[PDB]
Amino acid sequence: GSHMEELQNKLEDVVIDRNLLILGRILGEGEFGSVMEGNLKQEDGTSLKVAVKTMSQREIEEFLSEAACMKDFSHPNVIRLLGVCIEMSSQGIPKPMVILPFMKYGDLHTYLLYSRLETGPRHIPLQTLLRFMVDIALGMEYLSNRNFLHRDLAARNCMLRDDMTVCVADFPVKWIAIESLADRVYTSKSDVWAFGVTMWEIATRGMTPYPGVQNHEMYDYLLHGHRLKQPEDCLDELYEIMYSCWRTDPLDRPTFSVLRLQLERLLESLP
Ligand SMILES: [Cl-]
Ligand SMILES: [Cl-]
Ligand SMILES: [Cl-]
Ligand SMILES: [Cl-]
Ligand SMILES: [Cl-]
């Protein structure tokens, strides 16, 4: 059918020939896998700087399908997936590679922390912190409109592009909504909860959520109605917006389209 055909097309489009890519230095490494700098030879004969993230036949197929879907996203505030390559290890283990644009400014969380150091970016003014929030809201609004759930929204998974536009990427107890802690159920409103926490990371310029509270204590902390505290120098109206994201009942939380307009309005009002 059309659904099957659509997926077949996306699959064709997402794979990149291993020989159009060369891998460079490791930029980061963990239990999940690696990030390396790379070069991608493009259709026009010129090479592009890329970031390359490395991680059963079903698990490979699932990766491929998921990647196929993700490449299809087309929004300035959603990371553009350039494609994927599957290289096989010497021990016959598949090595799936995600190719992405190289972003010299890195993730938003690290950037916020650097901005509090002398060598890093200058003190980020309120208006710019808010613009970061609008951008993320715009990306999450897009995803939500196509019923895609992010499931790992946090400032560390938002990327800064060369023009300082933020995009959501990488689709963590202190980001998880109360209902997902309880019933392991996760909806678009759970992403909205994560977005509120992310807004708080931005307003605190990179603080870890819930200082003084440990991960194992989180469910009970939230259970007794405690939430993230208003950051110093955070507008009361901005705090109300982020607090709305943590309403106990998912259905009372605003949608991303509503949040986005609230945030845009607030930004407009600043001089
Ligand atoms: Cl190579
Ligand atoms: Cl991008
Ligand atoms: Cl970029
Ligand atoms: Cl901190
Ligand atoms: Cl707090």
What total number of domains does the chain contain?
Answer: 2
Ligand nearest to the CA of 213: 5
- Degrees to nearest 5, angle at CA 56 with 51 and 58: 85
Could you list the residue range(s) of the whole structural domain that residue 13 is in? 2-101
What CATH number has the domain bearing residue 235? 1.10.510.10
How many angstroms separate the CA atoms of 79 and 123, rounded? Answer: 26
Query: Is 44 exposed, middle or buried (CB count within 10 Å of its CB: 0-12, 13-18, 19+)?
Result: exposed
Same domain (yes/no): 193, 232: yes
Same domain (yes/no): 225, 183: yes
Same domain (yes/no): 242, 121: yes
How many angstroms separate the CA atoms of 115 and 123, rounded? Answer: 6
Q: Is 44 known to be catalytic?
A: no
Q: Which of 101, 132, 157 is the last residue of a domain?
A: 101
User: Collapsing DSSP states into helix, strand and coil, what is residue 94?
Assistant: strand
How many angstroms separate the CA atoms of 157 and 185, rounded? Answer: 21
b/e 7-43 (16+ beta carbons within 10 angstroms → b): eeebbeebebeeeebebeeeeeeeeeebbbebbbeee
Q: Which residues pair with 100 in a beta bridge?
A: 51
Same domain (yes/no): 9, 58: yes
106 is in an annotated binding site: no
Q: Which of 52, 72, 101 is the last residue of a domain?
A: 101
Which residues line ion ligand 2, judged by CB < 5 Å?
79-80, 101
Same domain (yes/no): 71, 122: no
Determine contact, residues 106/225, Cβ cutoff 8 Å.
no
Same domain (yes/no): 33, 134: no
How many angstroms separate the CA atoms of 242 and 253, rounded? Answer: 10
Ligand nearest to the CA of 99: 2
Determine contact, residues 202/155, Cβ cutoff 8 Å.
yes
**Paired tokens of 90:** 């010497």
How many angstroms separate the CA atoms of 26 and 38, rounded? Answer: 10
* Positions of E strands within the chain: 21-29, 34-41, 47-54, 83-88, 94-101, 158-160, 166-168
**What are the CA-CA distances from residue 97 to residues 66, 82, 100, 229 (Å)?**
13, 11, 10, 39
Same domain (yes/no): 56, 13: yes
**Paired tokens of 28:** 């980061």
**Paired tokens of 222:** 């939230």
CA of 76 to the centre of ligand 2 (A): 7
Which residues line ion ligand 3, judged by CB < 5 Å?
101, 103, 161-162
Cα 219 to the center of its chain, rounded Å: 23
Q: Which residues contact 194 (CB under 8 A, 6 or more apart)?
A: 150, 152, 153, 154, 175, 176, 177
CA of 65 to the centre of ligand 5 (A): 39
Same domain (yes/no): 146, 89: no
Q: Which of 78, 101, 124 is the last residue of a domain?
A: 101
Query: Is 177 exposed, middle or buried (CB count within 10 Å of its CB: 0-12, 13-18, 19+)?
Result: buried
Resolution of the structure in the document, Å: 1.7
What CATH number has the domain bearing residue 14? 3.30.200.20
Same domain (yes/no): 176, 226: yes
C-beta atoms surrounding 224 within 10 Å: 6
